[PDB]
Design a protein around this ligand. Structure first.
Ligand SMILES: COc1ccc(S(=O)(=O)n2cc(CCC(=O)O)c3cc(OC)ccc32)cc1
Lengths: 15, 263
């Protein structure tokens, strides 16, 4: 998955 | 959404101003030393590098690796800023979160190289928020691989800067760079391509009001976008080389996941 292989990035994406 | 086109340009622009510490109009006065009697410190050889490093963080290996790590710092800061910037593009946060990430994954460096042009001229570039200026020739004089990373970016920037875009142009450009319908692994293409269409539509109108004489400025910009894609793919492969055959070349985790399986 992506949301997993892009942790930090993902966290930035949500507020 | 057909409604929010009318102020779309204005909207994207002030997201750009809000979210990016350094911009073209700021870099240009600095690079033209007209607001100041006190120019940026010039890093043009190993000694002047060492001088600047004395400012410290306010590790420590070979010169190239030191330069290398510091660039990642600026890169991380910009990716972050771009992240916020994209959230501000109408309909971006309304996208599948796995799409919000692939858009950023493939788009950050294209947009970064595009924005880099602002802090560059044919002899070098502003660093450390405009307080420093590292020369092109010095960077080129670096060793084996490291002297190969910045040079192609100067090459792109010199041609991109000849277009004489302003920040209101550049903001829209970056927005279009980001909302690209043909990136790998995108879930609902259609929505995105619709986003693309609207941004390109206000871009073109903007170019025509803003640069009435440059009739094909927009097609020129389209080619820049293609050029940036190629540039980023190449850069991605150099960074991989260095990641393989360079022990002390650590990559910041945020950037680790960006390059991780890109090109
Ligand atoms: C000052 O701000 C920036 C922002 C970006 C760049 S860059 O051209 O993309 N660039 C990135 C890296 C490392 C990997 C990464 O940072 O992703 C790098 C290493 C170099 O070695 C001498 C030269 C240029 C480099 C330069 C300056």
């Amino acid at each position: 998955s992506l949301t997993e292989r892009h942790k930090i990035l993902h966290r930035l994406l949500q507020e | 959404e057909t409604a929010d086109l009318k102020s779309l340009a204005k909207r994207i622009y002030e997201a750009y101003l809000k979210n990016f510490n350094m911009n073209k109009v700021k870099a240009r006065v600095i690079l033209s030393g007209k607001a100041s009697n006190n120019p940026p410190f010039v890093i043009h050889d190993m000694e002047t590098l060492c001088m600047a490093e004395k400012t410290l963080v306010a590790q420590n290996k070979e010169a190239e690796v030191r330069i290398f790590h510091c660039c990642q710092c600026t890169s991380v800061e910009t990716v972050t800023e771009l992240t916020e910037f994209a959230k501000a593009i109408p309909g971006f946060a309304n996208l599948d979160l796995n799409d919000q990430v692939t858009l950023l994954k493939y788009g950050v460096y294209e947009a970064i190289f595009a924005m880099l042009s602002s802090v560059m001229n044919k002899d070098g570039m502003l660093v450390a928020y405009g307080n420093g200026f590292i020369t092109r020739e010095f960077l080129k004089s670096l060793r084996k691989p490291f002297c190969d990373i910045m040079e192609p970016k100067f090459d792109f920037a010199m041609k991109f800067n000849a277009l004489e875009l302003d920040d209101s142009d550049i903001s829209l450009f970056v927005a279009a760079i980001i909302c690209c319908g043909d990136r790998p692994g995108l879930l609902n293409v259609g929505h995105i391509e619709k986003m693309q269409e609207g941004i390109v539509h206000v871009l073109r109108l903007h170019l025509q009001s803003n640069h009435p004489d440059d009739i094909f400025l927009f097609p020129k910009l389209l080619q820049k976008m293609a050029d940036l894609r190629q540039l980023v793919t190449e850069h991605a492969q150099l960074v991989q080389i260095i990641k393989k055959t360079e022990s002390d070349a650590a990559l910041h985790p945020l950037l680790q996941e960006i390059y991780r399986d890109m090109y």
